[PDB]
Amino acid sequence: STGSATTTPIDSLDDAYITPVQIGTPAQTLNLDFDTGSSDLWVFSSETTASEVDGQTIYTPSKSTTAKLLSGATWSISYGDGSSSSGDVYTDTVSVGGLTVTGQAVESAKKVSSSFTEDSTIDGLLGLAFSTLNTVSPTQQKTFFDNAKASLDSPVFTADLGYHAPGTYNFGFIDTTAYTGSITYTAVSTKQGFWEWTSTGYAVGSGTFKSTSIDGIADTGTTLLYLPATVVSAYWAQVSGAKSSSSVGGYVFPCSATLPSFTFGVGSARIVIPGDYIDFGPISTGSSSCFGGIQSSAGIGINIFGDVALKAAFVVFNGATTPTLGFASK
């Protein structure tokens, strides 16, 4: 089997991407944030504290003839940005782009933190990291990909995120029309539960490539590119007027600037992030100070190849017995 679904930016900055997911019988379609940095599939639901729902589409398990309470199971998760959610668990039929999993753990939110409430466009998350990070207790549950894997033509999914445009998540096949050149594959460590890999270096604009190992995770659920402070300083030093602002919470730059590209290494191959991808617009409405799309990972404890980086590539998440990551230009 295979699946193929379009993923769509939630706003004009590509702050996140939503992908329609069918849950239950008859189908209830919710727009979920596919997140290769976590491993819970959770949804706004009929169980969510009413005051914490503001415009989201909810899953109502009582209206699904295939929903079954997973008795005793609870979940609770906290994300890198400080947001959180928790609740109980049902199993139900879940389909993504024509690919169907029966008995998928659907984690029903009883509580969500403010940032989820305030984002009316995201109805939940669908985790695509390794199932070892799944938070369901006392019986840990498998991700959608993990459940689908054996049925797939090939044990892979691909992320093809758009810049200010829709893109695609494919399951079970590699669309050879979706990228240029060849795919360069690179080793993955699953020891932390993430799609963790080592970039071979970077360049700033038309500058020379710096060979240096940068360990990080491929995380579709993180908006920006978080890298060591040395790397980030080297980038923003090429932008006149750019500075790190503690009050704003990172690097800002004059909105009148033309940003240089940023290149990152995948083995001997190179992925180029155009400068425009690194612009996240005025820090507040009408401001002439703009927020940068490359930020320091110092104090995160890990480097994060988020959407800024991933949307510049066609990315293969290879879930074979020995997982790997593939990157191609597009």
CATH number of the domain encompassing residue 291: 2.40.70.10
SS3 52: helix
Q: Which residue, among 221, 218, 7, 36, has the nearest Cα to 97 in the 3D structure?
A: 7
How long, in residues, is the chain? 330
Query: Is there a single domain that holds both residue 134 and residue 259?
Result: no
Q: Tokens standing for 238?
A: 């090429």
253 and 115 in a common domain: no
Resolution to 1 decimal, in Å? 1.6
E strand residue ranges, 36-83? 41-43, 68-78
Question: Do 222 and 326 belong together in one domain?
Answer: yes
In the residue annotation, 81 being an active-site residue is answered as no
* Strand-pair partners of 282: 290
Active-site choice (64, 199, 261, 296): 199
Instruction: Tell me: do 41 and 163 sit in the same domain.
Output: yes
78 catalytic residue (yes or no): no
Question: Is 131 in the same domain as 97?
Answer: yes
Same domain as 151, residue 13: yes
130 and 229 co-located in one domain: no
DSSP class of 278:
G
* 73, 14: one domain: yes
Note whether 87 and 156 are same-domain residues.
yes
Reference 250, options 275, 233, 238; nearest CA is 233
Domain identity same for 214 and 317: yes
Residue 219 tokens read as 């995380």
The three-point CA angle 114-115-118 to 5° equals 85
Instruction: Confirm if 127 and 193 have CB atoms less than 8 A apart.
Output: no
Q: What are phi and psi for residue 216, nearest 5 degrees? A: -165, 180
For residues 232 and 160, membership in a common domain is answered with no
8 Å CB contact between 213 and 197: no
CA 44/CA 52 separation, integer angstroms: 9
Domain boundary (139, 156, 174) is at: 174
Considering the candidates 35, 119, 160, 279, report the single residue annotated as catalytic: 35
Q: Are 47 and 75 in contact (CB under 8 A)?
A: no
Query: Do 137 and 197 share a structural domain?
Result: no
Q: Residue type for 108, please? A: S
- Count structural domains, the chain: 2
- Which domain range does residue 75 map to? 5-174
| Residues sharing a CB contact under 8 Å with residue 196, sequence separation 6 or more, in sequence order | 188, 189, 190, 215, 216, 217
Please give the Cα distance from 245 to 266 (Å, whole number).
Answer: 31
Nearest to 75 by CA among 24, 28, 41: 41
Whole-angstrom distance, CA of residue 109 vs CA of residue 120:
15
Approach to solving? X-ray
How many CB atoms are closer than 10 A to CB 118? 13
Which of 106, 141, 174 is where one domain is finished?
174
Assess whether the previous peptide bond of 138 is cis (omega < 30° from 0). yes
Boundary of a domain, candidates 141, 174, 207: 174
